[PDB]
Amino acid sequence: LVGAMDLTFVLPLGLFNPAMERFAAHAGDLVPAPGHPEPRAFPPRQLFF
Amino acid sequence: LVGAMDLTFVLPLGLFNPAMERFAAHAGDLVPAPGHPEPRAFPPRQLFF
Amino acid sequence: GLFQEAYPITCASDPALLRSARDGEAHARETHFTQYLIYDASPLKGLSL
């Protein structure tokens, strides 16, 4: 009665937001430092968990 | 039964945020005087605890 | 093997989206620009591990 359970999980990589979902919640958040690139605007090549 | 415990701790110094972790988290905040440099954008040489 | 399915895990393409994820799916950032978060739908949701 100490058993096992298998579960497959799924993660997307490099996928891409639909046209409507590319907004930001507010004008300033996750803002880059003043003269910087804003890496949040390029396509995601990574995934975190 | 009044015992003792030894714990080693760890602190980083002078390290540097990863590329994606170098963001403000909101536009205005920890904002310097309107005239000044905003030292928050340089590398940390110090540590506070 | 029965349901023919695989479950999402909480994952973000940002460290700062993933930081929103902790504390549950209330205020989690589900998209920021091209960055996306996916919260946990899985038999393990609501558990600790």
TrEMBL record, chain C:
Highest taxon above the source species: Viruses
Residues of the full protein shown: 1326 to 1374 of 1374
Record's protein name: Major capsid protein
Gene that produces this protein: UL19
